Every structure is written in structure tokens, then in C-alpha cells.
Amino acid sequence: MTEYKLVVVGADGVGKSALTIQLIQNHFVDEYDPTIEDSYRKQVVIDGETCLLDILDTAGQEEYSAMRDQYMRTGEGFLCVFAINNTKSFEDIHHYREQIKRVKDSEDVPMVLVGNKCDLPSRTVDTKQAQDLARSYGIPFIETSAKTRQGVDDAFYTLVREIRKHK
Ligand SMILES: Cc1c(F)cc2[nH]ncc2c1-c1c(C2CC2)cc2c(N3C[C@@H]4C[C@H]3CN4)nc(OC3CCOCC3)nc2c1OCc1ccccc1
Ligand SMILES: Nc1nc2c(ncn2[C@@H]2O[C@H](COP(=O)(O)OP(=O)(O)O)[C@@H](O)[C@H]2O)c(=O)[nH]1
Numbered sequence: 391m392t393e394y395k396l397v398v399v400g401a402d403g404v405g406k407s408a409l410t411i412q413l414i415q416n417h418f419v420d421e422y423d424p425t426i427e428d429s430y431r432k433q434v435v436i437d438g439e440t441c442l443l444d445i446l447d448t449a450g451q452e453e454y455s456a457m458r459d460q461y462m463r464t465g466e467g468f469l470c471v472f473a474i475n476n477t478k479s480f481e482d483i484h485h486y487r488e489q490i491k492r493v494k495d496s497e498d499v500p501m502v503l504v505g506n507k508c509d510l511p512s513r514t515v516d517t518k519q520a521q522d523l524a525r526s527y528g529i530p531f532i533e534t535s536a537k538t539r540q541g542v543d544d545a546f547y548t549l550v551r552e553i554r555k556h557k
């Protein structure tokens with residue numbers, strides 16, 4: 391009944407939509423239209439307290455706009471997703487954190503770094519690299535696979551805990 395607005399961001403193809411659909415509907419999407427941006431609702435019990443997650447699965451191209459800022463400003467907590475087999479998506483994380491800090495006008499914005507696709511046998515972005523960056527920013531790092539569900543509940547529940555600390 392308490393509602394939290396979560397926003398999922400990250401490079402094309404990292405698994406923003408797969409993460410969100412795995413959480414909400416307990417299955418893995420092979421192909422979810424990369425241009426569909428929408429919010430999906432899911433009720434969960436975290437540390438014994440029921441809440442409603444209202445999760446904005448972002449899409450878009452690479453445009454800046456104040457309009458997009460308004461959508462982004464609705465968020466209370468942000469999942470910043472890269473894929474462990476996509477160096478460029480890891481490189482893009484700093485941009486996402488900078489813009490979210492700007493929109494939220496705060497340096498402590500509830501946020502989790504998510505390294506998705508951890509089911510894959512070869513990573514180009516090592517655990518050490520991601521963990522170092524998360525530690526610099528003062529946010530948790532959680533490895534996930536939207537495919538197997540490994541870490542998925544942990545990533546979203548951690549973000550909720552981060553929000554609850556923030557309030
Ligand atoms: C976070 C954020 C914000 F918080 C507030 C905002 N207001 N307006 C946009 C925006 C964004 C935003 C988003 C919003 C989450 C929807 C997605 C992407 C984005 N993506 C969305 C999907 C995956 C990927 C391509 N398709 N990619 C890039 O690429 C960057 C371009 C500049 O060079 C470095 C990389 N920027 C994005 C972006 O910032 C735009 C930008 C912002 C400021 C300056 C230049 C470019
Ligand atoms: N192996 C693997 N593939 C994944 C994982 N998450 C997403 N994918 C795939 O990566 C592609 C992009 O996922 P999608 O969620 O649409 O990415 P988005 O552009 O970030 O919304 C799809 O083919 C997904 O099935 C994961 O954890 N493991």
C-alpha cells in the first residue's frame with residue numbers, strides 16, 4: 391500500500407525490460423520491443439512490509455529533453471543496468487548517474503548498480519571493475535540474470551531498502 395516509484399535505465403539491450411518482466415510476471419522475455427517505455431506495477435513484501443512497486447521501464451533514443459527530465463523526476467529509486475558482456479553499457483553508467491543526480495537535485499539518490507546477464511560464460515566487464523565503481527558512487531552493486539532470475543529479487547528489494555533508508 392506504500393508505493394515506490396522505481397526507474398530502470400541503461401544502454402540498449404542490457405535487460406531493462408527483461409529484468410522488469412522477470413520481477414513482475416516471473417518469466418524471461420526473449421524479445422520485448424526495445425522502443426516500448428511504460429510503467430508496470432508489482433506488489434511485494436520486503437522485510438515483512440508490503441509495498442507496491444511502480445516500475446518505469448525506460449526506452450527512448452539518446453535525446454536530451456526537459457520533458458524526459460519530468461518523467462525521470464517521478465523516480466524515487468533508480469536501477470542503473472549494464473550487461474557484463476557489453477563494455478560500452480558499463481561505460482555509459484556514469485552518464486546515467488550524472489543525469490539522475492541532476493534531475494533529483496541530490497547527491498544521495500537511492501540507486502543500485504546492476505550487472506545483468508551473469509548467466510553468460512564470458513564477461514568483458516569484471517566484477518572488480520563494477521564493484522569499484524559502485525563503491526566510488528556509494529551505491530550497492532548486484533549481479534543479476536533476468537534469464538535465470540539470479541539476483542533479480544535482490545536488485546529490486548535492495549533498491550526498496552535504499553529508498554526506505556532515504557525516507
Ligand atoms: C538518464 C536521463 C536523464 F536522467 C534525464 C534525461 N533527460 N533527457 C534525457 C535524459 C536521460 C537519458 C535517458 C533516459 C532514461 C530514458 C536515456 C538515454 C539513453 N538511452 C535510452 C535507450 C538506451 C539508451 C539509448 N536508448 N542513452 C543515452 O546516451 C547517452 C548520450 C550522450 O552520450 C552518452 C550516452 N542518453 C540517455 C539519456 O540522457 C540523454 C542526455 C542527457 C543529457 C545530455 C545529453 C544526453
Ligand atoms: N543471456 C541473457 N540474455 C538476457 C538477459 N536479460 C536480457 N537478455 C536478452 O537481451 C536482449 C535485450 O533485453 P531487453 O530486456 O529487451 O533489453 P532493454 O533494451 O535493456 O530493455 C533480449 O534478447 C533479452 O532476452 C540475461 O540476464 N541473460
Ligand SMILES: [Mg+2]
Pocket residue numbers: 406407408422423424425426447448449
Ligand atoms: Mg526495453
